């Protein structure tokens, strides 16, 4: 129960076949269901045919019968089309405004994040839509990283190298620290706690986080956390105040931040300022001189 993605109108409908299951308003949800292959919608109850042993998942084939949603041949004589007026049946019916341009969010929902144009879309669409672009992008590739094989150790040659087998069917991830693995100790009960290592080819050289001795048969996986939708947009709107509000200036300054002080004069007067941070010019010097200028 909340607001949809494009319209932000209060709604109760969530696209089942969609990546991250977002809220959608009635007309907005229908616009998604016809402009994508996402043919599943999930309100406070599931929109499926509740007669025993049915498999229909699209909403159009569904019709309301009594206290449920029914398919073509399972309905009673009394029925009603859930998909009518270009707005699917749902809570908060009238308070839906619809979105004129939905194809952007259809593209993001059908996106596989393969080409650069996917990222161009991810940053060109609107505020919560592009936050959702980030949500879906990440969600996709954590669903990706565990679709690779498991690094099951076979032999212990020596220190810093091992022998690695990988499960049949799914490929081997790249051989860098880009894909940080994590291990657990396989026992008679379950798997517990090795730690994060990254593997390269020797023989399989293993770069372990901590010191540790491994044996035969222990395997590591590329773990993912539980990614939960953000609240705020990427950054707050800009506002240039008249003066440094809420802050008390310093009394005297050291030389090594003079070119920095005549800088903090302006980040202090408005809220944000992107810093062209060329490598190694005193960047963390810039950071500490903020506190040197404002200690409290």
């Amino acid at each position: 129960v909340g607001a949809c993605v494009l319209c932000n109108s209060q709604t109760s409908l969530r696209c089942g076949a969609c990546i991250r299951r977002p809220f959608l308003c009635c007309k907005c949800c229908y616009d998604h269901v016809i402009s994508t292959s996402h043919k599943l919608v999930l309100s406070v109850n599931p929109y499926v045919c509740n007669a025993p042993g049915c498999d229909v998942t699209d909403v159009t084939q569904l019709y309301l019968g009594g206290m449920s949603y029914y398919c073509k041949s399972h309905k009673p004589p009394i029925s009603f089309p859930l998909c009518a007026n270009g707005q699917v049946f749902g809570l908060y019916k009238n308070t839906c405004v619809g979105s004129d341009n939905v194809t952007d969010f259809n593209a993001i929902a059908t996106c596989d994040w393969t080409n650069a144009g996917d990222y161009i879309l991810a940053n060109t669409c609107t505020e919560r839509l592009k936050l959702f672009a980030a949500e879906t992008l990440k969600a996709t590739e954590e669903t990706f990283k565990l679709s690779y094989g498991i690094a099951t150790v076979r032999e212990v040659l020596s220190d810093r190298e091992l022998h690695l087998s990988w499960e049949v069917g799914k490929p081997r991830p790249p051989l860098n620290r880009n894909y940080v693995f994590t291990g657990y100790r396989v026992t008679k009960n379950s798997k517990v706690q090795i730690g994060e290592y990254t593997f390269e080819k020797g023989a399989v050289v293993y770069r372990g986080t901590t010191t540790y001795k491994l044996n035969v048969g222990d395997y590591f996986v590329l773990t993912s956390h539980t990614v939960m939708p953000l609240s705020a947009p990427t950054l707050v709107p800009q506002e240039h105040y008249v003066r440094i509000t809420g802050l008390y200036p310093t009394l005297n300054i050291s030389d090594e931040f003079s070119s920095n002080v005549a800088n903090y004069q302006k980040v202090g007067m408005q809220k944000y300022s992107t810093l062209q941070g060329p490598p190694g010019t005193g960047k963390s010097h810039f950071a500490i001189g903020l506190a040197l200028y404002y200690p409290s």
Binding site: L91, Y92, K93, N94, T95
Partner: protein
Amino acid sequence: PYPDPSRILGAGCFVDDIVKTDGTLMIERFVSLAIDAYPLTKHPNQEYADVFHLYLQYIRKLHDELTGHMLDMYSVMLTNDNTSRYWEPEFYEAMYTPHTVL
């Protein structure tokens, strides 16, 4: 047979779950309790009939605030209900007269 008024009021106030801290979701239990707490309306003691009258007024408030809440979430109301009988004594009087209508 009239019940013990404290029993009726205690059933009104003290409940389980959380569903029942909100009258709108239930209503029907107040209908049943007002059905049970009717015969106090003929009791000479004044502070007994007021229990029944309070129950009637509370049912009325529950109904016409549920209609408002549904009206403000949606934009139309319950096209027809014929629910007035619930907040009038004619409905409850029927259940203590010898003519069964099951």
